[PDB]
Design a protein around this motif. Structure first.
Motif, PDB file in Angstrom:
ATOM      1  N   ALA A  26      -1.302 -10.952  -6.637  1.00 35.80           N
ATOM      2  CA  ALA A  26      -1.856 -12.848  -5.647  1.00 35.80           C
ATOM      3  C   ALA A  26      -1.019 -13.875  -6.819  1.00 35.80           C
ATOM      4  N   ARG A  27      -0.796 -13.808  -7.389  1.00 31.41           N
ATOM      5  CA  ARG A  27       0.304 -14.486  -8.281  1.00 31.41           C
ATOM      6  C   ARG A  27       1.431 -15.380  -8.474  1.00 31.41           C
ATOM      7  N   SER A  28       1.455 -13.810  -6.907  1.00 26.64           N
ATOM      8  CA  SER A  28       3.335 -14.350  -7.266  1.00 26.64           C
ATOM      9  C   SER A  28       3.074 -14.905  -6.124  1.00 26.64           C
ATOM     10  N   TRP A  29       2.196 -14.364  -4.789  1.00 20.68           N
ATOM     11  CA  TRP A  29       2.108 -14.927  -3.407  1.00 20.68           C
ATOM     12  C   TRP A  29       2.148 -16.427  -3.713  1.00 20.68           C
ATOM     13  N   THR A  30       0.827 -16.749  -5.146  1.00 17.56           N
ATOM     14  CA  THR A  30       0.634 -18.244  -4.897  1.00 17.56           C
ATOM     15  C   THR A  30       1.568 -19.111  -5.503  1.00 17.56           C
ATOM     16  N   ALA A  31       2.589 -18.343  -6.115  1.00 19.60           N
ATOM     17  CA  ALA A  31       3.859 -18.946  -6.906  1.00 19.60           C
ATOM     18  C   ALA A  31       4.481 -19.069  -6.046  1.00 19.60           C
ATOM     19  N   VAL A  59      -2.709 -13.638  -0.590  1.00 13.73           N
ATOM     20  CA  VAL A  59      -3.726 -13.344  -1.388  1.00 13.73           C
ATOM     21  C   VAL A  59      -4.479 -12.388  -1.638  1.00 13.73           C
ATOM     22  N   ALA A  60      -5.141 -12.458  -0.633  1.00 16.98           N
ATOM     23  CA  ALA A  60      -6.970 -11.435   0.288  1.00 16.98           C
ATOM     24  C   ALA A  60      -5.948  -9.896  -0.428  1.00 16.98           C
ATOM     25  N   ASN A  61      -4.813  -9.738   0.587  1.00 16.10           N
ATOM     26  CA  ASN A  61      -4.504  -8.490   0.699  1.00 16.10           C
ATOM     27  C   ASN A  61      -3.880  -8.294  -0.221  1.00 16.10           C
ATOM     28  N   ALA A  62      -3.101  -8.961  -1.191  1.00 18.75           N
ATOM     29  CA  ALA A  62      -1.664  -8.463  -2.108  1.00 18.75           C
ATOM     30  C   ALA A  62      -2.500  -7.279  -2.707  1.00 18.75           C
ATOM     31  N   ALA A  63      -1.092  -6.525  -3.762  1.00 14.09           N
ATOM     32  CA  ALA A  63      -1.079  -5.562  -4.559  1.00 14.09           C
ATOM     33  C   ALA A  63      -2.026  -5.440  -5.227  1.00 14.09           C
ATOM     34  N   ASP A  64      -2.428  -6.636  -6.248  1.00 14.92           N
ATOM     35  CA  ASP A  64      -3.825  -6.052  -6.923  1.00 14.92           C
ATOM     36  C   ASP A  64      -4.997  -6.738  -6.882  1.00 14.92           C
ATOM     37  N   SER A  65      -5.370  -6.495  -5.018  1.00 17.21           N
ATOM     38  CA  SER A  65      -6.662  -7.535  -5.118  1.00 17.21           C
ATOM     39  C   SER A  65      -7.720  -6.195  -4.493  1.00 17.21           C
ATOM     40  N   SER A  66      -8.598  -7.187  -4.243  1.00 13.65           N
ATOM     41  CA  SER A  66      -9.955  -5.763  -4.958  1.00 13.65           C
ATOM     42  C   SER A  66      -9.763  -4.637  -3.343  1.00 13.65           C
ATOM     43  N   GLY A  67     -10.008  -3.360  -3.618  1.00 13.87           N
ATOM     44  CA  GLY A  67     -10.798  -2.597  -2.850  1.00 13.87           C
ATOM     45  C   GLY A  67      -9.434  -1.253  -2.510  1.00 13.87           C
TER      46      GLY A  67
END
Ligand code: HEC
Ligand code: HEC
Length: 112
Positions: A26-31, A59-67
């Protein structure tokens, strides 16, 4: 896998394949979404509303996202796996490790 989101698939396939969300944290997509005017030497900027919508999906579907890497091609696993498998000539011909489809015929279908 595969970018199913129409806005993301449309805006982020303009200059390369639409990279799946699951490939970066997520942090990478945001960046990346925060500096689209200076996106790897090119102006990839979007209207603000669109930027937020694409970012929310990524972010919602990122590598480190929930699930902070900016490149899939700079990730530890990527470097480690491709070092064994990609000849210098293969890289020369593909022109960039960003060009997944030059080597992976099923890239656009999430098959690597
Ligand atoms: C042209 C104006 C672009 C648009 C629109 C988008 N991107 Fe892009 N992206 C562009 C370039 C020139 C590069 C560098 C390619 C190279 O060979 O070095 C990139 C690269 C990326 C990457 C990194 C790929 C990697 O090496 O792992 C990512 C993750 C990426 N782009 C994402 C992305 C998204 C989310 C976009 C829509 C908002 C998008 N790009 C649009 C050029 C352009
Ligand atoms: C040629 C110059 C390549 C480019 C550009 C990219 N990849 Fe690649 N990749 C390449 C080879 C020859 C292999 C080995 C195939 C095998 O079955 O062993 C790979 C491997 C991968 C993998 C599998 C990793 C593993 O766990 O073993 C993945 C997930 C992968 N490649 C993804 C990928 C992405 C996302 C790319 C663009 C950013 C990309 N590759 C570029 C050759 C080449």
């Amino acid at each position: 896998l595969v970018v199913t989101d129409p806005l993301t698939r449309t805006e982020c396939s303009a200059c390369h394949m639409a990279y799946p969300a699951a490939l970066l944290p997520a942090r990478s997509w945001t960046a990346l979404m925060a500096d689209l005017p200076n996106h790897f030497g090119e102006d990839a900027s979007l209207d603000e509303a669109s930027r937020g919508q694409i970012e929310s999906y990524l972010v919602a579907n990122a590598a480190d996202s929930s699930g902070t890497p900016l490149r899939i091609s700079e990730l530890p696993w990527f470097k480690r796996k491709h070092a064994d498998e990609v000849s210098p000539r293969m890289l020369e011909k593909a022109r960039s490790m960003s060009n997944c489809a030059a080597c992976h015929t099923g890239a656009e279908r999430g098959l690597f």
